Amino acid sequence: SPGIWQLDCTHLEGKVILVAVHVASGYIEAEVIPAETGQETAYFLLKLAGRWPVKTVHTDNGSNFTSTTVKAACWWAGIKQEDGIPYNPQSQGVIESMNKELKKIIGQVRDQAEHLKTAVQMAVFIHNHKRKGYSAGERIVDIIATDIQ
Amino acid sequence: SPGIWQLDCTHLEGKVILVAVHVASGYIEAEVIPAETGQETAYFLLKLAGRWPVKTVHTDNGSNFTSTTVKAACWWAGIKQEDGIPYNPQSQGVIESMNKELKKIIGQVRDQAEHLKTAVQMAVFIHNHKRKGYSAGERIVDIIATDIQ
Numbered sequence: 001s002p003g004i005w006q007l008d009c010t011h012l013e014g015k016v017i018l019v020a021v022h023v024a025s026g027y028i029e030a031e032v033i034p035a036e037t038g039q040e041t042a043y044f045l046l047k048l049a050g051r052w053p054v055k056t057v058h059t060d061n062g063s064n065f066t067s068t069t070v071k072a073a074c075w076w077a078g079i080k081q082e083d084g085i086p087y088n089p090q091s092q093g094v095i096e097s098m099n100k101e102l103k104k105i106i107g108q109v110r111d112q113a114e115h116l117k118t119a120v121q122m123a124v125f126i127h128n129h130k131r132k133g134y135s136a137g138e139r140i141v142d143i144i145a146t147d148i149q
Numbered sequence: 150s151p152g153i154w155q156l157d158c159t160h161l162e163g164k165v166i167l168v169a170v171h172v173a174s175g176y177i178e179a180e181v182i183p184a185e186t187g188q189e190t191a192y193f194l195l196k197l198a199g200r201w202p203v204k205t206v207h208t209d210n211g212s213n214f215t216s217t218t219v220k221a222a223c224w225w226a227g228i229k230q231e232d233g234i235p236y237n238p239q240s241q242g243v244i245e246s247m248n249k250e251l252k253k254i255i256g257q258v259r260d261q262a263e264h265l266k267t268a269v270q271m272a273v274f275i276h277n278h279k280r281k282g283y284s285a286g287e288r289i290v291d292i293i294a295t296d297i298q
């Protein structure tokens with residue numbers, strides 16, 4: 001549980017926003033990329049796993065699950081690559097809701113930056129700091145620290 | 150102390166590696182950029198503060214300290230922007246040693262990627278996971294979790 005992440009890809013402004021969600025906390029990292037290739041996804045996972053203790057990644061689609069570049073990044077970084085089949089149907093709903101929330105926040109900040117990437121990083125900040133009362137940033141640290149001890 | 154970070158800029162392959170170090174743990178994030186402009190630094194700090202609870206950043210030089218774009222990012226993200234004067238002389242040494250270690254690791258992985266950015270992210274991963282015994286990744290989470298609690 002402390003090490004499980006889920007990939008999510010959403011679209012805005014003719015660009016792709018790649019998101020990794022820490023399932024237990026709802027904490028996220030995200031980046032804007034031109035298109036969702038194996039190489040882009042692989043690089044994103046490499047960054048993520050250097051920053052947080054990523055044990056398992058549920059990939060966002062079959063192309064990323066299949067990609068030998070993504071498999072190679074998971075091998076490199078010691079990540080168990082898994083499918084993202086929503087065996088619990090609540091999973092699709094959670095992702096859909098998160099994409100809607102993120103796009104809402106991006107709208108709220110969109111005029112504060114020229115470039116979408118900037119707005120997306122503002123959105124990451126707002127999402128992770130939002131008290132729901134603990135924030136997702138607080139929850140991830142607490143969950144991982146409890147696991148370490 | 151749990152919220153204190155230090156910026157650090159080093160050079161390789163005619164490119165710039167921008168590093169943020171969490172002082173208390175030695176945990177790092179880093180990125181390759183073409184050159185160290187106010188905008189690049191501002192964007193990097195925005196990313197960092199969305200991911201970790203950044204209270205204070207000691208800037209790496211006077212240009213980044215002065216930069217109105219950097220001040221604007223720090224305002225946005227609620228970061229106290231400070232100078233990086235080594236009032237404790239041991240600070241220069243620590244930074245220099247870290248740059249040497251980072252460049253060492255990059256050399257050890259350099260043939261596993263075409264692009265320097267990939268090698269730098271591998272180096273971030275290796276540095277953060279290295280046990281010296283706890284890792285820097287373990288230390289940062291424990292320090293912050295203790296602070297929340």
Ligand SMILES: C=CC[N@H+](Cc1ccccc1C(=O)NCc1ccc(OC)cc1)Cc1ccc2c(c1C(=O)O)OC[C@H](CCC(=O)O)O2
Nearest residue numbers: 039040042043046069072073076260261262263264266267
């Ligand atoms: C077919 C992949 C290309 N190489 C092959 C390669 C070229 C030269 C030497 C070794 C290799 C090799 O296979 N090593 C094992 C390996 C595999 C996956 C992996 O995933 C992290 C890291 C390492 C690795 C690579 C991947 C993603 C990138 C890269 C690069 C790169 O070569 O630097 O560069 C930046 C790019 C940014 C995102 C974007 O622009 O899409 O993401």
Ligand SMILES: C=CC[N@H+](Cc1ccccc1C(=O)NCc1ccc(OC)cc1)Cc1ccc2c(c1C(=O)O)OC[C@H](CCC(=O)O)O2
Nearest residue numbers: 111112113114115117118188189191192195218221222225
């Ligand atoms: C002179 C700055 C340019 N704008 C001015 C702007 C343009 C339009 C509307 C508002 C503004 C505005 O001042 N808002 C307040 C503000 C200030 C600093 C800040 O820093 C996080 C974020 C927000 C903000 C900006 C900065 C760094 C970037 C950006 C962009 C951008 O406009 O999207 O785009 C990506 C780039 C990537 C790194 C690189 O390529 O150097 O970093």
